[PDB]
Amino acid sequence: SEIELVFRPHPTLMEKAQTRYIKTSGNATVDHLSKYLAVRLALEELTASEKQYTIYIATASGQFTVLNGSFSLELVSEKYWKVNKPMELYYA
Ligand SMILES: [Cl-]
Numbered sequence: 310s311e312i313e314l315v316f317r318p319h320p321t322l323m324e325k326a327q328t329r330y331i332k333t334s335g336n337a338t339v340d341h342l343s344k345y346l347a348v349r350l351a352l353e354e355l356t357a358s359e360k361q362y363t364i365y366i367a368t369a370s371g372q373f374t375v376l377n378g379s380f381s382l383e384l385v386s387e388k389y390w391k392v393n394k395p396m397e398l399y400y401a
Pocket of ligand 1: 328
């Protein structure tokens with residue numbers, strides 16, 4: 310299962326540039342994603358590549374659910390995001 314994601318800095322937990330659009334496998338884990346992100350941010354906002362990030366998913370009621378790092382993206386999508394839109398993911 311291919312998964313599209315849009316990543317944004319958590320709007321209150323990060324100090325107020327980019328939106329990042331990613332397509333990947335539903336088999337990738339949330340942890341893999343946070344490690345990928347640590348590598349991206351170390352270079353793109355320049356070890357810092359070792360820094361850890363928490364991943365949140367936007368909820369319909371305007372909240373943010375922390376995603377367990379062991380969950381596959383396919384499981385994330387089943388649990389929290391069934392809809393036909395890229396997953397709206399936030400990091401801090
Ligand atoms: Cl945007």
